[model samples]
Target chain A: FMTFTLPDLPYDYGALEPAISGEIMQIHHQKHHQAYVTNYNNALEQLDQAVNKGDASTVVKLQSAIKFNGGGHVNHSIFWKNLAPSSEGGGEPPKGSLGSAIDAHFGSLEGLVKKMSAEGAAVQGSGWVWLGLDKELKKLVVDTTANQDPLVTKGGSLVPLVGIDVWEHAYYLQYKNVRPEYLKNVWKVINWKYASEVYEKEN
Target chain B: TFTLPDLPYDYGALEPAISGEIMQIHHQKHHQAYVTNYNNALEQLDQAVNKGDASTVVKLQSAIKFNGGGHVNHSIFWKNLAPSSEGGGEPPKGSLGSAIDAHFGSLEGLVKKMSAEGAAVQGSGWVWLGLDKELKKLVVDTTANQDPLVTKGGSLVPLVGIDVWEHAYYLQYKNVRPEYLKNVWKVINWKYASEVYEKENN
Candidate 1:
């Protein structure tokens, strides 16, 4: 199937609590993400049928849908996994291997938090903050991807450890215009365990 | 949307570290020029984007990066330096010091890398030590010309930045960039850096 399916949320819609409200998640996921999924599948099917029939005109017509919906699907998939409820997901820095690694690279847990928070707050527009593994350096690196551009596609080649969505829609209802406040609070609910698993496997 | 801030100190206040003549020209002439040009280019680019002119948008990208970056960089550059009396110190303590030790292994390592990177900055550019989000680490990174790091939606979060543009130190150092960079460390306002560190940490 060329169509995308909505991945289940890791926790209850209200799991994020004080940081992200449930209403926003409902609209953002049900309305926005579903539209993208439906359109992306339709576009793929349209493109395929057009190619089989040699209807080249359909290629031009389907291009926008493919780009927009394709982008939405790719973006939302990554975005969903990037978040977790404060209790079940976010809160507390990683320990064991991830803890030692952070200390080795950044000096302290507070330092890492400070750096990541600064990067997240300072990002000017829609984008994501990434904790990536730099293969060449064999170390973790904090990086960002602007707009809907994926990190792997952008070529930093770092395995994503944690992804923080900075798009306004990600937190606008609760945080309002203050992006930094949301940036700071969301850290409480990060699924470090999941991130650590991804790190160990990818690295 | 960027503007140049007035220099907080008199031209001669920095004296031996930086000269009055250098400060005057650097701020009033060079930095101010960047601000004016950046504002102008942005205004023009807004019109072009509004008109759905892709070609014009492409053309203005470089201008925006250069002048816009210049305004943003220089604004930070001014704040990064201070009079020796303003608690610029040799003792690296606090969150910044701790981060340096944890990340780079030592204060000297940071200085070495920053010096190597800052001094080796090709053409007009900058070298910075920034925060990486996912890794939760501090990193050394570089940028070409006036490009603002995170403002452009880049992954690098700037914590400490060093400007290597000629306009930054040419009058006093006179092409001796390495010497200037080495000496500037003595005047680094760790207090300011610490504040920035604490601001991010909390």
Candidate 2:
């Protein structure tokens, strides 16, 4: 049986305090992320069963479940690594090749933040906003995807540098319905170190 | 500017085939939500266009497609059903009947195929009976999550659509989607389908 497990948060739940509350992080990690892991594994198990039985129709039908839950799992795993406690350098502005690339593409660090936050706030429903590297163009780009869809699913040549979960579940408990406030505050806990490493490796 | 259309008949008109409770919520709540969101998306798109903001315009594409398609599909869906006492479940006659026979052997055969396809959709989606204008053939297709049949492109004319979303039948049929699929044919507006077929064929 294929299995997936929720990853441990690199920092304590309350570490991001003023930005993301302890309660939101705990529920988001323990409940929301765990559900995606469990559901994704279950979907894969069912897919294997369908394939073994030579059930072509069921195999076709399970594709969306696989994509949605699997995407959720993949995106959340990246998301956990995408943030850290400010004490450990979380939300520190990028300072290397990634920083230069951001400047080259978006003009400044603040420009990137404003653009990404605007797109994140504008998402119509449950989804994610990402700062990704287009390997071919050698530039940073921002994009969004709906309903737990992963960035790579839409962007073939792009490598994810940072992903911000825009699902209301990502912030609703703490921020209420004010997504713009959540997006703005989330930057304080963003793990620029991880993003820089991702950019360096991809570039 | 999009608006919800009135259901062709009272909510209870479809009766045992589709419950009045399900009809009421599906139309007033679900369909109304789509209409409102579609209009909102269009307004946002217009603002983005006027501002010459291509990125925002690009971002609004999914909103437009999902809600806009939801509106278009539901509008057609309301007209594509009728009470059994009012021509529902009657098999097609004339050229449409002949075409059904030629394409799928018989009315029963087409029903079986379409129902199977409808029941098999993994999530919120639609099963369509469409006319391929170029090939002049009856085709069965499925679209995910409110995607309109026309999105498939290449001169497709939607003749009949069966919404397989859980909200469409979950209250009445619960987890047994196959049951809902089979029963829906009892109210399948074949009269409308026939008229569509005749128009498209000619």
Candidate 3:
């Protein structure tokens, strides 16, 4: 009976303003994210039926649907929580242990931002750029995935702290084809508090 | 010098099996884009190599593979199809026919098995009938997202490749991919496949 559902945005659509337009946010949330949720649920249902029927070929065939749609759902859910209104403490530099770790690994908060932005811009096709924790090293690392592959699916001790979607639908309307601009501006609405919490919990 | 090769026949040659509209868009738009990008990536790669910039070279790997494979795969795909009037869809003759019978029991079996495998692919990819040199037999294999058969290594020479990307059929078949698979064999140039089989086997 379990089904995936789209989560509501934590802030008003217009909250991010110039950093991310309300129009983009609304369509991204309503159309894109919801499509992923719907497709994920559908894939899950089909997979379950395929399993019960002992149809291994069908089960195999459903893998892409599950991964693509399920990853989209998971990534977008985290992305929504990872943003906040600037007035409500969004885009503030990381504080506490997370801030110290960023400094230790990336030199400074600005350094981390620059590196992540550059990497995000370089991602080919539709994909995501991630700031993830290497649990064994206890350090932040930048990585990317092609298409909607989630961080966990990459298979390691790396835990996603923050992710920026580089899929065209994410910023094509507002930022045009200049992905670097989107990456440069997305930090203005990043919810450092949530990212810090993720890092803390994972560690 | 990666370039988009012209279709061997007219865009409309494939007919009801694959619409001219799909052929035009796929060749002119999709395949051309891949060729253009491959050329651009190669230019950057050449610069990276000349400058001894290992990082830039590493970064260009996916771009090269994706676009290069698109060029390689499509080049073969165009030759794999011909008009029925030109003997398209005819069963393999000579040694290739013997191999097919020996391995898959009959031409019908090979067609059924390949079509099923093609339909079963979970994402954008290709279903291939290849010649395995070591085993000296025909093998049905697949590659994901513009990955070339050569990447599979181990003396696997591609004989026939059927593209399963959505863009290959979605405009005409919609979501019914199995139908596309069923129809594609109608235009499959088994003569070309036989030539590949004989060359690889020798």
Please give, for residues A18-122, the per-residue lDDT of candidate 2 as tens digits.
999897788778876887799899999999999999999999999888888899888999999999998999889999898898999999999999999999976
lDDT value for model 3: 0.86
- Compared with the true structure, the alpha-carbon lDDT of candidate 2 equals 0.86
Looking at model 1, the pairs that clash are A90-A189, A90-A190, A91-A188, A107-B102, A131-B134, A142-B132, A142-B133, A144-B155, B69-B146
Q: Any idea what lDDT model 1 has? A: 0.70
Q: Taking the candidates one at a time, how many backbone clashes does each contain?
A: 9, 0, 0
lDDT of each: 0.70, 0.86, 0.86
For all predictions, the C-alpha RMSD in Å is 20.3, 8.2, 6.9
Residue A181 displacement in candidate 2 (angstroms): 20
Question: What TM-score does the first chain of candidate 2 have?
Answer: 0.96
Ranking by TM-score: 3, 2, 1
Better of 1 and 2 by lDDT: 2
**TM of each candidate vs. truth:** 0.49, 0.57, 0.62
lDDT score, candidate 3, position B128: 91
**What TM-score results for chain B when candidate 1 is compared with the true chain B?**
0.89
